[PDB]
Every structure is written in structure tokens, then in C-alpha cells.
């Protein structure tokens, strides 16, 4: 880890502010950083593009991000970006032109000092076993 005490990786995203687009009832934005992989954020009425921004309260080194979904199968099209205090922005997982299945979680290597995490579901790919699901994110973790 980059943190003293040594340990391994720390979830510095956990409990941090989450802002973005409308949530449906019982599925608010905070569910993205609550440390529980079963609780979800779901966009109000499946409205897309849907976004979520985790504020890490200033620059922290982050090794890699963890984008967790409800389960495997969903065919969402999603962008994941990062931002520092300086105003620099970098797409770390560009998957907006996705066709076919998404897996349950994604490791997204960063290895940069960042202050913000921009997760954006831009649309839904045709087909799949779950063609009916709404724009949802279970958890985003920031490992440093
Ligand atoms: C039956 C189905 O497609 N379930 C999905 C889907 O649920 C929708 C919504 O989130 C619920 O609040 C509502 O009661 O049912 C909707 C179906 O029209 O999407 C979510 C993820 O976005 C999944 O949890 C369900 O499995
Ligand atoms: Ca959660």
C-alpha cells in the first residue's frame, strides 16, 4: 500500500461523498461508497446517461479502482474517469462502445494522484439475459 500504517490496499473511497444524477427510492448515490457490495445505486427510472462522482476530499494516490455491479450479465455502456486538484482528467476505463456482457467487477489500474472519480453509464447494449435492468452501480472502491 501507499499508506502508513503499511497493511495492504485501503478503501479511501469508502464513506466519501457521492454526487450525481437522480437515484430511485431506496437506492441513493451513497450506496456506491458504503462498503457493502449488495446495496446498489439505481438511476431514477433507468434514465441514461447516468453519472456518479466520488469526492476523495483532495489528492490521494490510488493504485487501482474497483467497479462493482449487482451481478454478472448486464450489458451497460460505461465510462470511468479520474480528476486531480489541478484540473487534469483521464479516462481509465473507456467502455462506452460496449456490446455483450459485463462481469460483476472491474479492476481499473490508475497509479496516479487523484481527487475525484467520475463513473458514467452512457447507455445499454442490445441483447443479453438482463435486457430490462436499470443503470446501476453496486460499489466503487479506490485502492491506495
Ligand atoms: C425484473 C428486473 O428487470 N429486475 C431488475 C431491475 O429492476 C428494476 C428496478 O430497479 C426496480 O426498482 C423495480 O422494482 O423493477 C425494475 C424492473 O422494471 O433493475 C435492477 C438493477 O437496475 C435489478 O436489481 C433487478 O434485478
Ligand atoms: Ca454498495
Numbering used by the authors: 1200 to 1343
Paper quotes:
GlcNAc-α-1,4-Gal is displayed by the deeper gastric-type mucosal class III mucins, Muc5Ac and Muc6 and the catalytic activity of CpGH89 is directed at this specific carbohydrate structure. Though there are no aromatic residues present on the adjacent wall of the binding site, it is at roughly right angles to the plane of the W1333 side chain and thus well positioned to pack against the A-face of the GlcNAc residue. Markedly few hydrogen bonds are made between the sugar and binding site suggesting that binding and specificity for this disaccharide is driven primarily by hydrophobic and van der Waals forces and accommodation of the unique carbohydrate conformation. O1 of the galactose is completely exposed and oriented out into the bulk solvent illustrating how the CBM might tolerate extensions on the reducing end of the GlcNAc-α-1,4-Gal motif, which is consistent with binding to the glycan microarrays and to the recognition of the motif as it would naturally be displayed at the termini of glycans on mucin. The O3 and O4 groups on the terminal GlcNAc, though solvent exposed, lie very close to the protein surface. It is unclear whether modification to these could be tolerated by the CBM, thereby allowing it to recognize internal GlcNAc-α-1,4-Gal motifs, but the proximity to the protein surface and steric clashes that would likely ensue suggests that this is unlikely. The C6 hydroxyl group is buried in the base of the binding site and thus extension with additional sugar residues would not be tolerated. The presence of two CBMs with the same specificities indicate the potential for a multivalent interaction, thereby increasing the overall apparent affinity of the enzyme for regions that display clusters of the GlcNAc-α-1,4-Gal motif.
